Amino acid sequence: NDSILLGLIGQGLDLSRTPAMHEAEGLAQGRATVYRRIDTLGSRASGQDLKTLLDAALYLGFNGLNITHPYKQAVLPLLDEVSEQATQLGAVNTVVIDATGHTTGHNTDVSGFGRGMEEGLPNAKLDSVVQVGAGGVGNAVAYALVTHGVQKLQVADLDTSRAQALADVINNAVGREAVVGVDARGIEDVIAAADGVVNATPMGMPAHPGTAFDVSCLTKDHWVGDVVYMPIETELLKAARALGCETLDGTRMAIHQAVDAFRLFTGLEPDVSRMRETFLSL
Amino acid sequence: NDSILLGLIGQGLDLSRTPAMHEAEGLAQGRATVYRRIDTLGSRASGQDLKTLLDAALYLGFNGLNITHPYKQAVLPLLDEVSEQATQLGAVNTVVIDATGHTTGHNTDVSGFGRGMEEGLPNAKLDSVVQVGAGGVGNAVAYALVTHGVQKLQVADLDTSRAQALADVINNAVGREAVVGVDARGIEDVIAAADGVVNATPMGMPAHPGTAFDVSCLTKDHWVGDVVYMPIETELLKAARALGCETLDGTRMAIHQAVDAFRLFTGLEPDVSRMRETFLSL
Ligand SMILES: NC(=O)c1ccc[n+]([C@@H]2O[C@H](COP(=O)([O-])OP(=O)(O)OC[C@H]3O[C@@H](n4cnc5c(N)ncnc54)[C@H](O)[C@@H]3O)[C@@H](O)[C@H]2O)c1
Ligand SMILES: NC(=O)c1ccc[n+]([C@@H]2O[C@H](COP(=O)([O-])OP(=O)(O)OC[C@H]3O[C@@H](n4cnc5c(N)ncnc54)[C@H](O)[C@@H]3O)[C@@H](O)[C@H]2O)c1
Numbered sequence: 412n413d414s415i416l417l418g419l420i421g422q423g424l425d426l427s428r429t430p431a432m433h434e435a436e437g438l439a440q441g442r443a444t445v446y447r448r449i450d451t452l453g454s455r456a457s458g459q460d461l462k463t464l465l466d467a468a469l470y471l472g473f474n475g476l477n478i479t480h481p482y483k484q485a486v487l488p489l490l491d492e493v494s495e496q497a498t499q500l501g502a503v504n505t506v507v508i509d510a511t512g513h514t515t516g517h518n519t520d521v522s523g524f525g526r527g528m529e530e531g532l533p534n535a536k537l538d539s540v541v542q543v544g545a546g547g548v549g550n551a552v553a554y555a556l557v558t559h560g561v562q563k564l565q566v567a568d569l570d571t572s573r574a575q576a577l578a579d580v581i582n583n584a585v586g587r588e589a590v591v592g593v594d595a596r597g598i599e600d601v602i603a604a605a606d607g608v609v610n611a612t613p614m615g616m617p618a619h620p621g622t623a624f625d626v627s628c629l630t631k632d633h634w635v636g637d638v639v640y641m642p643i644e645t646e647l648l649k650a651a652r653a654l655g656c657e658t659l660d661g662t663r664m665a666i667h668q669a670v671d672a673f674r675l676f677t678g679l680e681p682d683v684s685r686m687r688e689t690f691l692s693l
Numbered sequence: 694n695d696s697i698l699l700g701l702i703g704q705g706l707d708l709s710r711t712p713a714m715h716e717a718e719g720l721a722q723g724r725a726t727v728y729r730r731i732d733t734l735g736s737r738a739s740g741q742d743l744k745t746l747l748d749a750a751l752y753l754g755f756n757g758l759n760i761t762h763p764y765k766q767a768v769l770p771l772l773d774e775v776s777e778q779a780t781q782l783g784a785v786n787t788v789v790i791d792a793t794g795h796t797t798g799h800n801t802d803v804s805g806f807g808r809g810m811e812e813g814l815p816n817a818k819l820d821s822v823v824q825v826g827a828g829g830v831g832n833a834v835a836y837a838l839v840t841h842g843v844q845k846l847q848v849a850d851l852d853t854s855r856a857q858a859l860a861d862v863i864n865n866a867v868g869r870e871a872v873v874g875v876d877a878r879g880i881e882d883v884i885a886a887a888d889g890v891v892n893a894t895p896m897g898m899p900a901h902p903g904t905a906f907d908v909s910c911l912t913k914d915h916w917v918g919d920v921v922y923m924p925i926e927t928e929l930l931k932a933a934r935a936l937g938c939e940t941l942d943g944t945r946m947a948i949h950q951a952v953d954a955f956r957l958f959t960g961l962e963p964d965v966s967r968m969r970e971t972f973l974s975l
């Protein structure tokens with residue numbers, strides 16, 4: 412019945428649904444659970460170095476942390492151990508803290524997106540996929556794609572250098588040329604020839620209305636995924652659904668990263684439907 | 694329904710009943726509550742300076758802390774504000790942390806012992822009392838005694854200097870010569886002439902069996918108190934009860950310090966009977 416203490420280190424955390432998911436699921440399994448935002452833009456933690464905040468969590472009896480932007484790369488050298496996937500990606504979003512203070516980094520963005528593919532695109536054809544966007548979440552998405560059956564992934568970003576760096580990282584991680592950086596300009600023709608496409612840009616959010624490419628390149632035979640989870644039905648996914656395409660909405664990864672982290676943090680088997688419920692309720 | 698995060702900074706905390714009391718009462722009032730030991734003898738926090746640990750709690754989203762030995766004096770200069778009672782005593786056991794990180798020190802050992810007198814000795818004659826022991830908890834007990842109606846308190850300690858320092862601190866706090874240091878040797882004759890006596894030494898604990906003075910000096914008309922709370926019925930209180938004396942057991946202060954701190958930490962009205970229940974159940 413031991414209480415569970417967790418937090419999230421990052422910037423601009425007020426709207427995160429991750430604390431609620433973990434607090435509700437802990438309680439549902441008979442464990443009082445606190446999950447605190449540790450926001451370096453906020454009044455409590457501003458100006459503090461990542462190492463200070465990590466060490467604080469160790470001293471205070473935290474059982475785990477999530478890590479978000481801008482710290483998912485910076486955190487790695489601070490940890491005692493890092494999983495092979497998080498090591499090869501160079502990004503950790505989950506830190507398990509042992510009873511006595513030892514830290515292990517994991518990446519449940521990767522495992523969560525992969526689980527979302529299994530759950531929401533079980534029959535998808537994976538030979539050729541395009542991903543638009545190579546930022547933060549895009550790196551984990553790309554790794555997930557090519558580890559969950561994608562043979563060739565073409566990644567486009569306005570910043571070609573980001574796409575090519577992504578490709579190098581993932582290809583090294585997997586040990587094959589799974590990923591190719593391609594130009595953003597003319598990406599429609601590349602998507603048209605592919606089996607599926609994933610949006611890993613901010614486009615579709617209320618503050619970034621529209622789509623990252625012209626949806627007229629889609630066909631009924633494509634599948635389409637999106638990382639954006641608010642709104643759940645982005646303009647891109649609306650356009651795909653209108654053609655009869657299978658779609659993967661961004662809530663799947665957002666929920667499953669938390670499912671997977673909860674399991675790592677606690678050793679308990681999370682109830683996916685309960686955590687999904689909490690996510691959707693906020 | 695916001696979750697509550699609390700801890701205790703001190704040494705040798707495994708057997709504290711304070712975390713359980715606060716966790717259970719938070720939950721009973723519909724708030725998931727974590728209360729962590731922050732033990733500088735343990736694996737998480739050893740070697741860290743008090744200031745490091747206090748700052749950690751601020752950064753991490755703690756709502757409050759208790760402070761125990763050896764830090765109840767050292768903590769004062771680290772806090773933004775300290776209550777008048779804790780300031781004059783020179784000892785803080787409770788730190789309220791505001792939403793945005795500001796700290797206020799309080800002393801609920803003082804308020805808790807006083808409440809115990811009201812609750813368990815409502816009819817006690819208070820003109821002349823003896824206290825044996827001037828350590829850590831003894832300072833708070835002495836302040837409580839003379840602020841809850843004791844006219845003259847005689848404090849004995851094997852270390853006369855500790856008793857006289859206590860007397861100076863309390864007398865300054867109250868603004869009268871309420872307390873006098875007296876020799877431990879011959880304390881029985883002093884107790885015999887007094888209305889009541891309080892044990893503030895370790896005597897009566899399993900590892901300190903016996904009594905701090907010869908109980909043959911007690912009469913049926915005395916009242917007797919004890920700070921020791923395990924066992925609840927110390928040899929001293931057994932001897933008092935055998936004569937028909939009213940007695941004050943150490944659980945009252947131990948419970949009420951937590952009642953009072955919970956109120957300060959949360960702004961909720963604690964249920965005393967529930968917290969007492971939790972205490973006794975451990
Ligand atoms: N599902 C989830 O769990 C989850 C979690 C966090 C964030 N997100 C979403 O992921 C989005 C991306 O997050 P991020 O932190 O990687 O953002 P980021 O800004 O670091 O990366 C976005 C990338 O998209 C590129 N881009 C923008 N428009 C483009 C276009 N038209 N064509 C090609 N590239 C384009 C940018 O150059 C940038 O490199 C966020 O806006 C958020 O909506 C989802
Ligand atoms: N009720 C409660 O909430 C509560 C909380 C914490 C501790 N305690 C109890 O309080 C006891 C005292 O705690 P402390 O931290 O102040 O201990 P301490 O060791 O700092 O102080 C005890 C004092 O008793 C004196 N002493 C010992 N035997 C004596 C004797 N025969 N005559 C005169 N003086 C004597 C010592 O010289 C010392 O100064 C603990 O052992 C514990 O059982 C009670």
Ligand SMILES: O=C(O)C1=C[C@@H](O)[C@@H](O)[C@H](O)C1
Nearest residue numbers: 427428429477478479504520
């Ligand atoms: O702040 C959020 O909502 C989160 C964002 C992602 O970085 C996740 O990986 C993190 O665990 C939770």
Ligand SMILES: O=C(O)C1=C[C@@H](O)[C@@H](O)[C@H](O)C1
Nearest residue numbers: 709710711759760761786802
């Ligand atoms: O560790 C304990 O059991 C405690 C001891 C006293 O110092 C109290 O004042 C503190 O709040 C809790």
